[PDB]
Design an enzyme around this catalytic site. Sequence first.
Site, PDB file in Angstrom:
ATOM      1  N   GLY A 162      46.247  35.372  43.831  1.00 15.87           N
ATOM      2  CA  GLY A 162      46.880  35.950  42.639  1.00 15.87           C
ATOM      3  C   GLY A 162      46.483  35.183  41.391  1.00 15.87           C
ATOM      4  CB  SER A 163      48.446  34.435  38.371  1.00 13.80           C
ATOM      5  OG  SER A 163      48.691  35.757  37.982  1.00 13.80           O
ATOM      6  CB  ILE A 164      46.440  30.318  41.875  1.00 10.23           C
ATOM      7  CG1 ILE A 164      47.924  29.928  41.893  1.00 10.23           C
ATOM      8  CG2 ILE A 164      45.594  29.114  42.236  1.00 10.23           C
ATOM      9  CD1 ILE A 164      48.562  29.845  43.251  1.00 10.23           C
ATOM     10  CG  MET A 165      42.058  33.435  42.508  1.00  9.23           C
ATOM     11  SD  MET A 165      41.119  31.970  43.029  1.00  9.23           S
ATOM     12  CE  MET A 165      39.493  32.326  42.376  1.00  9.23           C
ATOM     13  CE  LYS A 166      46.162  36.756  35.780  1.00 11.60           C
ATOM     14  NZ  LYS A 166      47.603  37.091  35.807  1.00 11.60           N
TER      15      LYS A 166
END
Length: 331
Positions: free
Chosen positions: A65-69
């Site tokens: 999820g957002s950890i990849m942004k």
Amino acid sequence: GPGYQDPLSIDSKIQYITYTNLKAAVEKFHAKAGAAMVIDVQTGEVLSLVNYPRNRVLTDVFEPGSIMKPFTVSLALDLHRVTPNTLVETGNGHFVLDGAPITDDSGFGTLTVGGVIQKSSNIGATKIAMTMKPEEMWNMYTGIGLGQAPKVGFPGAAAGRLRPWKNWRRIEQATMSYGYGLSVSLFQLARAYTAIAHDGELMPVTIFKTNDAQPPTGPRVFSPTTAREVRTMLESVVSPQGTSPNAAVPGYRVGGKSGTAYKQVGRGYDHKKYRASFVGMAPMPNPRIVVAVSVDEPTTGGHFGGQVSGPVFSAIVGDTLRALNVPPNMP
């Protein structure tokens, strides 16, 4: 330095600190399970490695999820497609790409590239991602160790799933830009964030102590300027204006990123069956430790709601930095 615990890198104090905090969290939020670990940034040594109850840290894979942004932004900065001040239009929080809808938790309007990390904008990530080719992004995913089983002496370490890039529809590049349609272990995410911590160098992450004679070295995944700039952005996340202020650590500058994985149902996603993960590093701007925390299927959010991992990160980071005699770098 030398002692009876040699040649393992695990510090009994940090391991205990990691175990009490993680266990307390899993119990307090009546969760199914938890994982947490601490990596020394200079050496890539694992200072702690904790599961409450089996080794799910290395075996269990999920959508990051957002950890990849920050990695979407890391690549775009590193390819000179954007600067930290580049403007990204996210409008009212509803955007459509090849007939698919992409949604922010609110309408953030005009953000900077930094703004996209701070506010955790899916729309902003997607539009940054659309400046890059699938191959470029797949190479970066492969460079930070995604899709590859870690070799740390544990048989059955999960490799996770990464679709080959020539198969990517433009909407999958989008979803992957905000951490959906790929799977990782918490261990892979902790290692990936060492590349942001260690000025762009992916450190070998090892349960054994390294030699000062021949210090560990790794592939250069990003420029150092790319890494300092993402570190500034990770710090912005844990401000009042970021999405994870509950990760803040009294006395220390910290930075990190939260994400949520929901239970897959083949094509859909279940309601309140989710995994709350957080990965960060402290103290900023030159971190000593990366800390990763994952709490699976919590059921009593309380004052933290869904963002249950940030305060566990917070507690482990303060205890660990005190335990290392690192002086407060914040009023």
